[PDB]
Nucleic acid binder design. Sequence first.
DNA 1: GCTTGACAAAAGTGTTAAATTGTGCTATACT
DNA 2: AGCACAATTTAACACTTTTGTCAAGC
DNA 3: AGCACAATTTAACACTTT
Lengths: 49, 108, 264, 50, 49, 98, 50, 49
Amino acid sequence: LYRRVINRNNRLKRLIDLGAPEIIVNNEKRMLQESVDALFDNGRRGRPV
Amino acid sequence: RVLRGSRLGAVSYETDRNHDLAPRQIARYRTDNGEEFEVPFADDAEIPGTWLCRNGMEGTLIEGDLPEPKKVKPPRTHWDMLLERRSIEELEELLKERLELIRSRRRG
Amino acid sequence: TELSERGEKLPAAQRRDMMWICRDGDRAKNHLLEANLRLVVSLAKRYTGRGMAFLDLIQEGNLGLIRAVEKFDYTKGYKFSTYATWWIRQAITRAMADQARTIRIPVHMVEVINKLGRIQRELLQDLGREPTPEELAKEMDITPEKVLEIQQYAREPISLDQTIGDEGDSQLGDFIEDSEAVVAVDAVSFTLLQDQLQSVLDTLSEREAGVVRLRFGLTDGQPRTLDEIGQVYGVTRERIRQIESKTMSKLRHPSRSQVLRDYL
Amino acid sequence: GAMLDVNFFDELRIGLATAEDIRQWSYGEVKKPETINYRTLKPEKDGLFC
Amino acid sequence: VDRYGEYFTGAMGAESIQKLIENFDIDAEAESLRDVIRNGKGQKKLRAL
Amino acid sequence: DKIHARSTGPYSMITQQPLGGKAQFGGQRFGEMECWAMQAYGAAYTLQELLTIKSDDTVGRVKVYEAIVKGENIPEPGIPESFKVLLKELQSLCLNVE
Amino acid sequence: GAEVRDGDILVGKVTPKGETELTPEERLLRAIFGEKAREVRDTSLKVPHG
Amino acid sequence: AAPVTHIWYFKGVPSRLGYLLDLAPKDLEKIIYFAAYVITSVDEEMRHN
DNA sequence: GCTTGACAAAAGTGTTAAATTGTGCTATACT
DNA sequence: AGCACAATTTAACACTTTTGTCAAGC
DNA sequence: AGCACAATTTAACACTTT
């Protein structure tokens, strides 16, 4: 779970510096939110990892 | 069966001490967002200019040495990927072309 | 940027049209990616099930699409998808090499692991049995001492937090003995060994006990050389060495060896 | 009040942690998704075991 | 946003929730919630507790 | 197949409590209802001894063994090392437990 | 046909240990009696307790 | 690189972020998981005059 | 009790080749 | 997959210096 | 699986425009 959080965080940090359309950045931020939610309390919102 | 395991490391048995320890000096680095970090070092040690501080970002020493920018580049900054495959004469005879399309489309 | 320094200043007409041309150029770079997101999804949907989740495959394909639209040439007279499929497949497979294992393996070792696994499955299907290490090294042009060493890299960690028996109260971590812990009947024995060592070393003379305690580092923890003791006692290395060679003969006396023989 | 928490307990207070408190406990930022080396079985720098 | 886009601000996600929490005067909501349960009644009073 | 005894054996990994079962060495579990019985007796010191210097007090474990072998008095217990794991798992949930 | 009991060695197995450095007391105790370091470990198969 | 709401203070019962902002949880999930824009401010003077 | 000469192994030290790791690129068309 | 190329880490060897040991001697 | 419980909807209502 820590690896998935820092993975999606590094990919967001790369997509922002590279310059990207809004859809890819919003999808990355939603994936980051779901990764941190899976870290803190799994299986609460949506299906569990 | 039992299946012993170990996180790789060691446990030494020197009884601990607290009086004679080789002497140390303190450096102080300063990061980009005005933070100060104190780092101990041995006396027989070349104190480096830049240090990766506890904040997560690099901080230089408090002196005015200014060691190196080390001439590090961009990398590929698109353009370069445009200029390496297409030359300036082909772009200048294209861009102006596109520029004239701004003139003709505006009035019809 | 080349005219945002010395060289000129531009009138408002050329400023307006060149800023509009730049703003229009920034729009097609979004339009092309928004067109080809479905191609990214259709390529990434047949790598799932091994290692990475589906959305991570889509996002690495999106990074590959940005690279492919950065390095695309329209004057070669080909469709965009034929060129972009290469970069998208490369991004997905490189991500599955880099960020799919808990212990990160470099991509050349992931390449030889994939090649070994493919050759093993092909020889299994040809043979109807499991192949052998010396049989596998014949196909892959390596030594058979390399094949099992490669095979002992691709073993993924078994999770510590699963229930092991049908009685679900136990997990795996309740069965693993911590071997790097302090055995309580050894830390007492080491203390009594230190006390017995000082009690035996006190029956020697004044200088030979100091020679031994500096030669083996019993007081400070850091050992010394013969020149280091000869510096503090004002003699050469051969005078210190014969003192030590006499003291070690005095310590092999049974009155000095019997009380210490039990600790080894 | 007592980070070593050795035998002097008067209270034990819970509360929300602001972001100034999280980068005050911490000893540095982990910035790579790496755990340990595959050959030398030593922890890599700036990873989850650094 | 392209038309009448200067009269407001809007966003998505946790940064917008952080922006709403920034412009949140606790004393106004506290006095209003004190006054609703003091004057009004019904479901509106039962919610405001 | 049933008789078991343990003075000191293997300890666990994350929390340093002893193991379980005759396959390992393992200690008998002094669970919840046994704690209620010892609290209802009024025996504070036996409960504190069973819960600190016999399971978790990591520097108390070898100190009790040394004091028993040399023949001295049993020292005062410290803090259990399974409580300091709880402070870390609460601080990792973004809760300023102080 | 050999009768065993609790603690006897069944299979004599010895695993290489690579490296560690001894305490000064044990390094003195090796130099007195004249015994080598023997860097390989000792993981034999002994019968379980009882 | 982008903020993230704590899951305990959004997916509880009752949701504390929903009570603190007077937003429904079905609207809060639409906001923080990138499904609906939220107006966070509006200049009342310019829109008035 | 203690020093000198001589010799030999062990330990640092510099350089240089190999092995190991990181990163870019592959153009029929494919949604 | 697969290959090409630069950057980095390792190991291997040559050569020097330290540390240790033997026989002689007042 | 269910047993309880509290939060969150269809619908059922009079009240006020149209």
